[PDB]
Amino acid sequence: EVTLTLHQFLPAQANVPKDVLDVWADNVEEASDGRIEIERYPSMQLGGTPPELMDQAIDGIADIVWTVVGYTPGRYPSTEVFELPFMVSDARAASYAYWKMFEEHMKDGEFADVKILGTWVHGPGMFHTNKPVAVPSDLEGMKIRGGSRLVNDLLTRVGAEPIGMPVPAISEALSKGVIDGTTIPWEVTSALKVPELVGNHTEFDGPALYNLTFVLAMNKDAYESLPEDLQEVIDSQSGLAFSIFAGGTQADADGPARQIAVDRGNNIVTVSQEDAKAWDALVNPIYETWVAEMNDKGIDGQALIDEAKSLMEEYDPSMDTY
Numbered sequence: 001e002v003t004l005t006l007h008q009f010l011p012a013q014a015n016v017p018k019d020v021l022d023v024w025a026d027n028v029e030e031a032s033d034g035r036i037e038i039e040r041y042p043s044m045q046l047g048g049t050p051p052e053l054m055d056q057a058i059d060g061i062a063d064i065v066w067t068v069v070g071y072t073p074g075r076y077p078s079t080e081v082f083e084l085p086f087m088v089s090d091a092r093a094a095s096y097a098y099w100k101m102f103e104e105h106m107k108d109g110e111f112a113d114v115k116i117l118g119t120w121v122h123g124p125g126m127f128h129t130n131k132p133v134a135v136p137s138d139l140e141g142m143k144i145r146g147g148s149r150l151v152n153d154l155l156t157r158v159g160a161e162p163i164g165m166p167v168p169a170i171s172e173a174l175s176k177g178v179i180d181g182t183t184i185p186w187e188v189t190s191a192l193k194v195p196e197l198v199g200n201h202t203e204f205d206g207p208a209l210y211n212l213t214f215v216l217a218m219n220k221d222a223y224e225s226l227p228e229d230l231q232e233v234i235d236s237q238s239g240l241a242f243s244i245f246a247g248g249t250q251a252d253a254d255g256p257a258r259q260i261a262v263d264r265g266n267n268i269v270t271v272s273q274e275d276a277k278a279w280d281a282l283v284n285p286i287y288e289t290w291v292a293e294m295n296d297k298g299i300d301g302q303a304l305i306d307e308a309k310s311l312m313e314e315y316d317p318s319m320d321t322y
């Protein structure tokens with residue numbers, strides 16, 4: 001008999017809590033043969049702001065968290081390789097690449113302090129806005145919410161005023177008019193009532209404008225101090241295949257959410273790959289400043305970008321078992 005607490009920042013019925021974390025938690029419960037019990041706390045019920053979740057898991061406030069790596073900005077700089085503009089065409093391939101790279105580069109450097117169970121990205125990042133956005137010029141003077149320093153850099157370069165705030169705060173911020181719009185993929189839009197609060201959406205054909213990285217993290221001491229066969233049980237239900245499943249389940253949930261916006265009669269602008277090039281011209285210098293930043297930290301930035309593209313093409317869709 002062991003009770004582990006999982007703390008996370010969205011409601012219990014949202015896509016990732018329901019179809020990724022519960023699934024994962026039940027799999028741990030089963031493979032343990034009812035010897036591990038995992039209690040699930042949503043919407044920061046045990047207290048804190050979403051950015052403190054990692055520290056909650058490192059310090060032992062909670063055993064397990066699902067958080068957004070970028071809410072601790074520049075803390076895990078190697079994850080940023082997947083957050084560069086127009087990097088990612090498939091979330092599964094990204095998550096494959098992310099887990100593989102986590103093991104080689106990150107596990108014992110930047111994530112030494114914590115146990116990582118899962119490394120993934122969401123579906124295509126996009127805009128949701130009070131007024132229409134069909135070309136970059138339309139974002140000039142708009143206050144746009146972003147969730148990470150690289151998204152904020154992206155917003156600056158296309159001419160928006162970036163407002164850093166965690167995702168649950170979006171509804172209140174739109175309602176009060178603190179922001180004119182937000183970045184987020186489709187899937188989380190319905191839990192935040194975004195399609196109710198704004199009437200315009202801007203999506204991209206081709207590689208994603210951006211996506212953000214996530215982890216399922218666990219307290220190290222709480223892991224190590226399990227017995228050897230229960231450690232084996234946690235690891236077995238986590239890691240590479242789990243990371244591929246979370247990314248894919250999260251991206252696949254874009255579809256039903258986009259259709260809820262369509263059903264309302266909201267205006268959705270789809271930017272062709274050809275028309276995306278104007279956006280790329282504005283955002284693509286992030287590649288050079290990011291590599292300069294990494295080099296300033298003694299990190300081979302270009303090697304991470306090359307490696308990440310290498311691994312993603314390499315992804316076969318039958319490394320996807322979970």
Ligand SMILES: O=C(O)/C=C/c1ccc(O)cc1
Nearest residue numbers: 016068122146147166167188
């Ligand atoms: O942009 C952010 O601040 C967070 C993004 C996010 C997107 C989908 C989720 O299910 C949770 C967080």
